[PDB]
Design an enzyme around this catalytic site. Structure first.
Site, PDB file in Angstrom:
ATOM      1  N   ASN A  25      -7.735   9.007  -5.580  1.00 61.91           N
ATOM      2  CA  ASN A  25      -8.547   8.019  -6.275  1.00 61.91           C
ATOM      3  C   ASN A  25      -9.521   8.707  -7.227  1.00 61.91           C
ATOM      4  O   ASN A  25      -9.863   9.885  -7.063  1.00 61.91           O
ATOM      5  CB  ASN A  25      -9.324   7.154  -5.275  1.00 61.91           C
ATOM      6  CG  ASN A  25      -8.432   6.546  -4.213  1.00 61.91           C
ATOM      7  OD1 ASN A  25      -8.644   6.748  -3.019  1.00 61.91           O
ATOM      8  ND2 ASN A  25      -7.428   5.798  -4.643  1.00 61.91           N
ATOM      9  N   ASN A  36      -8.757   5.591   3.543  1.00 59.70           N
ATOM     10  CA  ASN A  36      -9.500   6.382   2.560  1.00 59.70           C
ATOM     11  C   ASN A  36     -10.306   7.508   3.201  1.00 59.70           C
ATOM     12  O   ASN A  36     -10.929   7.330   4.252  1.00 59.70           O
ATOM     13  CB  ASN A  36     -10.454   5.468   1.789  1.00 59.70           C
ATOM     14  CG  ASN A  36     -11.119   6.168   0.627  1.00 59.70           C
ATOM     15  OD1 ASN A  36     -12.282   6.569   0.711  1.00 59.70           O
ATOM     16  ND2 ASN A  36     -10.383   6.325  -0.464  1.00 59.70           N
ATOM     17  N   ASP A  53     -15.026  -4.220   9.820  1.00 58.99           N
ATOM     18  CA  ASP A  53     -16.235  -3.677   9.214  1.00 58.99           C
ATOM     19  C   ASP A  53     -17.054  -4.722   8.464  1.00 58.99           C
ATOM     20  O   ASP A  53     -18.201  -4.437   8.106  1.00 58.99           O
ATOM     21  CB  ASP A  53     -15.872  -2.502   8.291  1.00 58.99           C
ATOM     22  CG  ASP A  53     -17.085  -1.736   7.800  1.00 58.99           C
ATOM     23  OD1 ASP A  53     -17.854  -1.223   8.641  1.00 58.99           O
ATOM     24  OD2 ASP A  53     -17.259  -1.636   6.566  1.00 58.99           O
ATOM     25  N   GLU A 104       0.817  -1.211   0.000  1.00 57.04           N
ATOM     26  CA  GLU A 104       0.000   0.000   0.000  1.00 57.04           C
ATOM     27  C   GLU A 104       0.853   1.264   0.000  1.00 57.04           C
ATOM     28  O   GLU A 104       0.515   2.240  -0.679  1.00 57.04           O
ATOM     29  CB  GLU A 104      -0.930   0.018   1.214  1.00 57.04           C
ATOM     30  CG  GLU A 104      -2.031  -1.032   1.193  1.00 57.04           C
ATOM     31  CD  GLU A 104      -3.112  -0.737   0.175  1.00 57.04           C
ATOM     32  OE1 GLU A 104      -3.148   0.385  -0.371  1.00 57.04           O
ATOM     33  OE2 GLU A 104      -3.928  -1.645  -0.097  1.00 57.04           O
ATOM     34  N   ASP A 135     -12.622   8.602  -7.590  1.00 57.22           N
ATOM     35  CA  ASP A 135     -13.865   9.116  -7.025  1.00 57.22           C
ATOM     36  C   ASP A 135     -13.697  10.445  -6.291  1.00 57.22           C
ATOM     37  O   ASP A 135     -14.689  10.986  -5.795  1.00 57.22           O
ATOM     38  CB  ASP A 135     -14.590   8.056  -6.167  1.00 57.22           C
ATOM     39  CG  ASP A 135     -13.904   7.775  -4.828  1.00 57.22           C
ATOM     40  OD1 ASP A 135     -12.799   8.292  -4.573  1.00 57.22           O
ATOM     41  OD2 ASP A 135     -14.488   7.025  -4.014  1.00 57.22           O
ATOM     42  N   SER A 187     -11.793  10.879  -3.551  1.00 54.08           N
ATOM     43  CA  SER A 187     -11.163  10.590  -2.277  1.00 54.08           C
ATOM     44  C   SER A 187      -9.648  10.461  -2.450  1.00 54.08           C
ATOM     45  O   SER A 187      -9.111  10.457  -3.564  1.00 54.08           O
ATOM     46  CB  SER A 187     -11.740   9.309  -1.672  1.00 54.08           C
ATOM     47  OG  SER A 187     -11.404   8.180  -2.456  1.00 54.08           O
TER      48      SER A 187
END
EC number: 3.2.1.17
Length: 128
Positions: free
Chosen positions: A46, A59, A101, A35, A48, A50
């Site tokens: 990103n 994120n 999550d 990462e 989108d 973000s």
């Protein structure tokens, strides 16, 4: 800060990530390698809108606040810049929430594509 491999392994273990939610320490070191390449300052935008922050590329749409992401939820209740610190505490606390999550470590796309199903123990080999 760019952590050494075994340096990060020791820090992640001290912060309780080894075997957290069933994921052995090597899974976390492998995830951080792909990462961020162990660099606490890494940031990546990103498509989108973000951005992903820090050693575990957390994120800004769901987890931290960067002030420029539409639909941000800030579920870790932390500014995204705090996830860039040389002290990994804030990134670990937030990663513990992410991995709980529902999807486990599949939340980290680089873990899914480059660590899952591999010999992750290699990432802690040689460390004491």
């Amino acid at each position: 800060k760019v952590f050494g491999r075994c340096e990060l392994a020791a820090a992640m273990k001290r912060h309780g990530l080894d075997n957290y939610r069933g994921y052995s320490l090597g899974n976390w070191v492998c995830a951080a390698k792909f990462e961020s390449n162990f660099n606490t300052q890494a940031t990546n935008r990103n498509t989108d809108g973000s951005t992903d922050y820090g050693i575990l590329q957390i994120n800004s749409r769901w987890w931290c606040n960067d002030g420029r992401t539409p639909g941000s939820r800030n579920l870790c209740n932390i500014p995204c810049s705090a996830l860039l610190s040389s002290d990994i505490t804030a990134s670990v606390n937030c990663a513990k929430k992410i991995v709980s999550d529902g999807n486990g470590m599949n939340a980290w796309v680089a873990w899914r594509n480059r660590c899952k199903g591999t010999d992750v123990q290699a990432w802690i080999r040689g460390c004491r």
